Design a protein around this ligand. Structure first.
Ligand SMILES: O=C(O)CNC(=O)C(=O)O
Ligand SMILES: [Mg+2]
Ligand code: NI
Ligand SMILES: [Zn+2]
Length: 331
């Protein structure tokens, strides 16, 4: 078995190997990459996502989210308070203000310590889930706006034709902005490109150990657990590395820098934070190996997680028994 300790793997494809996306994903899995839940891909030196970022300030962040925490430093939830619209130029200036900027630090490890110690005492503002793309249309390789669609993968594997579309999303972050512990909708893959700015640190639990994380989360968030049988789908809960180590949960960590891709694999729980002002682009995708995960994926039916038009069809075809109750949650 390849990668039996489930370590995060890092890949350095040549420009020749960067032509065929599906084939490279399948290569990475042949080496065991999926067992970690997360992989890093460093693009060939010849490749670029676009020529410059010099004209991005006029993108609108229509609903910036202020991430307010409750709990203790290592075990907290966050809620998203909606703020007034602002441009990317306005958001970048805010991120660089004395109130919100990255503190002085020695290295990534000192900054990680400061994040876990101090996150709960601040409320950083995140521009999340903004439909759009920063890839130039002439970028032919690993362009996240030109991938094969999940609807087309389901049709190719299963023969069924379904409604829905699959498009990327932009994320504009600042120091302390946080992504809670989650897997993807319908336990899909995701791919994330860090276009610009400061790094993003990731934590991940191997898929084969995801249920260990769920059991710990039911213990740490007991009221949430009684309210919903899949409450990590709400994307609100944070658990520190120290707490995960104290409770014996297997995990790994890695820092992504500008210019690098990350891939999350089906049922790979992940969480993390941004080090300063940055812009990432991400999209879900599928392969043949995903289909069985999609059939088994948990769902939120309490009604909090409230998800896309396209997830309807996935539930309807892969989880017909759940269909009914899940659409009661989404209506
Ligand atoms: O970058 C972020 O805030 C969160 N992204 C993801 O969870 C991902 O790409 O799967
Ligand atoms: Mg602009
Ligand atoms: Ni994710
Ligand atoms: Zn729920």
């Amino acid at each position: 078995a390849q990668n039996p300790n489930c370590n995060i793997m890092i890949f350095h494809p040549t420009k020749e190997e960067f032509n065929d996306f599906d084939k490279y994903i399948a290569y990475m899995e042949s080496q065991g990459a999926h067992r970690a839940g997360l992989a890093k891909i460093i693009p060939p030196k010849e490749w670029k996502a676009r020529e410059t970022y010099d004209n991005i300030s006029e993108i609108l962040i229509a609903t910036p989210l202020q991430q307010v925490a409750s709990g203790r430093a290592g075990v907290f939830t966050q809620y998203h308070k909606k703020k007034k619209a602002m441009t990317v130029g306005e958001y970048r200036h805010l991120a660089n203000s004395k109130k919100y900027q990255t503190p002085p630090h020695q290295n990534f490890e000192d900054l990680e310590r400061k994040y876990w110690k101090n996150r709960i005492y601040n409320s950083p503002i995140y521009g999340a889930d903004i439909s759009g793309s920063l890839f130039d249309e002439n970028t032919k390789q690993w362009n996240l706006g030109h991938l094969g669609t999940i609807q087309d993968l389901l049709e190719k594997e299963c023969g069924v034709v379904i409604e829905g579309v699959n498009t990327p999303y932009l994320y504009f972050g600042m120091w302390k902005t946080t992504f809670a512990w989650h897997t993807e909708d319908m336990d899909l893959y995701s791919i994330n490109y860090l276009h610009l700015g400061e790094p993003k640190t990731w934590y991940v639990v191997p898929p084969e150990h995801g249920q260990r994380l769920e059991r710990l989360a039911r213990e740490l968030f007991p009221g949430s657990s009684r309210g919903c049988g899949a409450f990590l789908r709400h994307k609100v809960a944070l658990i520190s590395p120290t707490v995960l180590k104290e409770n014996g949960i297997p995990f790994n960590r890695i820092t992504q820098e500008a210019g690098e891709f990350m891939v999350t694999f089906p049922y790979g729980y992940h969480a993390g934070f941004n080090h300063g002002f940055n812009c990432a682009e991400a999209i879900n995708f599928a392969t043949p190996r995903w289909i069985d995960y999609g059939k088994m994926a948990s769902q939120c039916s309490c009604g909090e997680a409230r998800v896309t038009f396209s997830m309807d069809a996935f539930v309807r075809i892969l989880q017909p028994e759940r269909y009914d109750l899940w659409k009661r949650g989404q209506d």
